[PDB]
DNA sequence: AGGAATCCATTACT
DNA sequence: AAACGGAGACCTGGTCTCAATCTGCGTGTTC
DNA sequence: AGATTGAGACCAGGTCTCCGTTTCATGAGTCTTTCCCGCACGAGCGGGGGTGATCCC
DNA sequence: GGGATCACCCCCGCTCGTGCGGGAAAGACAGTAATGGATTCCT
């Protein structure tokens, strides 16, 4: 049960006879269509109709994403046309017995040192609010960046202190990757467990498990070395791209989702961040030809 | 293949109906000219290209000058020209016509020569019957539009019913039929709702313009004449 | 009243002023107007012959589900239907 | 450089209230002769065109054919190059709108018109005529109002004009 | 009793104090408006609102015409706000017996020799058609003009024998000045006597008093000398323009119409044109002064 | 509001789903975003599509679209549907245009309850055939009876138009057929699919959560597409096939006759209203100035952007 | 549904291609479409904050007997109010 | 007697 | 005198090609 | 690789005065009757939206 | 009572119908012109 989350950039993609061929900048790749389960289409990538017809038959998930999935724009069908995860998700969100169960499960994942499952969620936001405030302060101490209180404005991105702009900019980079995987695997973005009422309610909830681990420290780190005038909005995006280059965060969350949904171990389908050129020796056993 | 009639002028068919066109325009201190087959009103700041087709009567006030070819160009549209001055209107102008059927005129002739016919129209006239610069602006706007529609359909301004004995006798009979109805309440409102430093000429004509379009008085011009003429 | 608009360019100056009797001129060789459907062809028929050399096109209120329909004659912006839908075609040189 | 000279005539002007009467065309390229013409049957002819050219129901039934097949053949042989003719933009507008009724497809051609380029060399008055333009370029032959005669007439007009 | 039909060409008009100021390049004119009854304006002339005002209050007549009346464009108020003529003109058309008498006088004005009292409208229409057919025929060969037929094309007049446009141009030429005079005099063209049901019904019943005398002799005259490749219409128009400059024809319409409308000789108002550069000698006693 | 940047706009600027056109077809052409304009690179020239007035932008065989081109279309909510031979091959869509999600939450809570599922399944079939009483039977024979009505309807229409029917029922999942009746009906139906595909994304409805049909990621479309396929596209499709002549691109002719049915049928006003009836959404003028909120079983929904530690 | 007309002189090319997603281009720098009162005004907010140093004007149906009201910002052809009737003012030399 | 000029009869055209 | 029309006059806003730089437009524990 | 910004060169076309040239583009010896075409008008109506009752909690 | 369910208008956009005021198109209205047959003259 392996899912291939192949990412492609600067490429024109079509088919020759029965396999997807990729005409990128520095060569041509001929990966078989069977392997492609989930495709990550980066910026400046072109798609041919015949390839779509070939990939439409295999149930491949097509998602238009930013550079290394930094930002999500549009999505196609789910992976292998499956919908089991979406159905289980719907059942869990509808009943409070399961609504609490997952809510504690995420909240516990944000408190590895404390088990607060038995305490009512009213103070959980208070307990969580202290944790992020603690995380904000200690991160500020490490990088010596002044921090008083996170203030922002959706209508006023440029104004305010850079750190809030940098922190806000890095967060949006995080939503893109996690929103890509949920659409490819078949999660409904609207059905949010903790957040509710917005089409991204799940996205802010699922990314909440990675607020305190990746996006916040990177934003503090890049803002510390950044000076006045530099467009931290793109600077934060580029470094968050670097943290996504390895794809370890891709594997981490793809296992957490069905873990959050109480999917049995047999149903734990794993996504492997296969790359056309970062896994040269890994694709050639399957019988793929490369052109330069 | 082309099958094209001669162009460069306009047949009354291409002109919109007397109802579709607007009520009136007011011009001051301008030199009217006809450039590139277009009527233009030239002010010191700049020039304006009036859409003569979509306007009924084009008033002209003190200190304005009009070229000959402009009058010719306006006559093609058939829009009436009225020279508005201080203390009431001064002199009138008109094209030739807009409708080629003289039925209303012929009926107008029948109703004017027969004395008993005049009494019928005069009695029919009565049924739908029931600060100086401000009231004057309302009158001339009323006079101009009613003259244009009368001249559009070929009706004779000379042949009046009550106001008689002058070349524009019919206009003075049809215009005052609506004077006490629309303009008077509007004129009273201008005097009550007035302020110093405001362009009375601009403001008074602006409100009278709204009253005419809101009240569908232009709609009533054709119908009231048609029913009064049994056409 | 339904709205119709006519554009002009590279046409004799007489036409560029003639339409001003009917249609206001926002900018160089563009016009707007509110005429009955009967008046539309009469203005266009004049434009069909008084045009001379140049380029012109017209838009107007239409019963197509977009709301407008396109008329172009000897224009680099050819109008081509897309299943009963007006679109502008710009052939490459 | 390939062009098609198309000449057609309707029973009026309105899109929904009028119908195509005759269709004939010739491609004017490389000087090879493939002269084609067609006719449409009908039962009602307006008096004005009747007096101008002469069209009757008997003629349409004895010679004219079905609208759909004639239009299909037209779309078949006009799919390669542009459509050119005298005052041809107005005719093409109506003809393409007619393809909408019968669903011929998407006509893709440049709407360029021969008459507009002819008017340029004078730009004197606001009205021009066919026999005015033809005599200006040494085309003494008058209008036969038929498909092939007008086709060769416009062919000679294109040879003489050559603004393209 | 006295009416002045002044015709100004190629000049502007204003006032200084109480008289119009012709702005021709040749000089400066200050004709008082007290003696002015009708004011004809030719092409290329200007008139100001401030100049017009005195024209209205003195009861003059402002009439826009072509070159000395070849075509009519627009008019204004008639003489001295007097409707004594249209009112009498009104009561004649409505009464058939009056219409019989007026129509009969129209024919006897064209042909005093023939008896007309027994005739009716159809008789007058038929007899006139017989007469003009004879007049067309006899005069055609007098000028060595091959006249195939009189065909007038209201849409495309260009195609045809040179006489047709020439005759049409000659015909429409007279229609102009007669319309301007009758509008200045104060009779609407709607009230026809023989012709009816048209805007110019009265014109087509009045112009016939001079069609056989002015139009046809000059129409064939230009047609006889007409050359190939020329606007016969323009040449005919030029010749008709020269004929109109003499005011002797103009003196007829003012006289004939007054007689035609049964106006008593005491009430008849004779008129004559007053040229600006040709009647200086006689206008000097009237108060007209000239400056160069 | 915020600054306006070339290529992006909010939902307030965009017109509602009911004030938009049907669809476009493209064949043998390339799609690109040049000068911040969605464009089609056909054989002869280019054309700029006003995507805001586009419900869905269909893609035939031999078409290409770049990544940046999809982004522009995704901002305005236009679905992307690839319809080649054998019916549609793949689907694509962007963000939900509407900011509220109350339509989506009702769909999830309704689908779990079989009693709610059964009543909606009876409500959905009532609109298909109001003349019948179906408030008793259960799912297993809805497919039989809805299917029987569909099969019988197809047979009668085919006989009337005189077009022979192979008896193969339209299956969007791997459609098969090459005879002129096939692509006549297949192209007609996928036109209905495109408008439905966008509106479920436009209103924020999960495409894979359907009642009658389950087991694939586009189930909900199939359930609601059937609400009009037997009433709109099938009558039109067979009409085209009957009048179809030899050597003519019937796909074009068929595609045109759809829109005439679409506009006259008042589908957008009807179809959007029908989704309300199926979801039984109460009528109320919700301002929803606060779209997102935090779930609170004890106390309704608490807002966001607040540190609850103090 | 009131008609909308858009003209553009010396405007950045980004807006010229971006606004095609709402209107069709009958002529270069000239755009037209059929929106409501709300949508059209928001499209003004787009052009007003991206034209910069440029020229743009619009017309839309209104409750005037001429049938439309003029809208203009930073354009050579200004608009002058003649007793409520919107007419094109063109400055001269 | 026959044609031909004339006249009348007549349709026909302006 | 006005106005058109042409032949000049030179105007410039748009189209196009060319590197160069970029992958993108950013609230959800802000009060 | 697909896309945007900019600098660069381009230039057709809008605009200008000057110059020449027109004073305009062309029917109605007869109206009357019966036609045709129209978009005009009202008014019929659907159709829901809003409003108003019952129906269900 | 409130929400939920089943029905109340209004009325206004929408559709359609006649229909009216315009076409155009013929068909009337008189004496001559022109053609041909009867009459008369001529071979």
Author numbering:
A (entry chain B), E (entry chain E): 20 to 311
B (entry chain F): 1 to 130, 182 to 282
C (entry chain D), G (entry chain A): 1 to 93
D (entry chain K): 126 to 289
F (entry chain C): 2 to 311
Can you provide the manuscript's text about this entry?
CRISPR–Cas adaptive immune systems capture DNA fragments from invading mobile genetic elements and integrate them into the host genome to provide a template for RNA-guided immunity. The natural Cas1–Cas2/exonuclease fusion (trimmer-integrase) catalyses coordinated DNA capture, trimming and integration. The Megasphaera Cas1–Cas2 retains the canonical heterohexameric architecture, with two Cas1 dimers (denoted Cas1 and Cas1′, a or b subunit) bridged by a central Cas2 dimer.
Isolation and refinement of particle clusters representing maxima of the reaction coordinate gave linear and bent reconstructions at resolutions of 4.1 Å and 3.9 Å, respectively. The DEDDh domain was visible only in the linear conformation. In the linear structure, a Cas1b′ C-terminal loop (Leu279 to Ser293) rich in charged residues is positioned near to the major groove adjacent to the second integration target site. A C-terminal cap, which follows the C-terminal loop, protects the PAM and adjacent nucleotides from trimming by DEDDh. Notably, the DEDDh domain was visible in the linear structure, but on the non-PAM side of the complex, where no overhang trimming occurs. The exonuclease sits in a cavity formed by the interface of the CRISPR repeat DNA, Cas1a/b′ and Cas2, where it appears to contact the repeat DNA backbone and the N terminus of Cas1b. These interactions may beneficially constrain bending of the second integration target site or prevent trans activity.
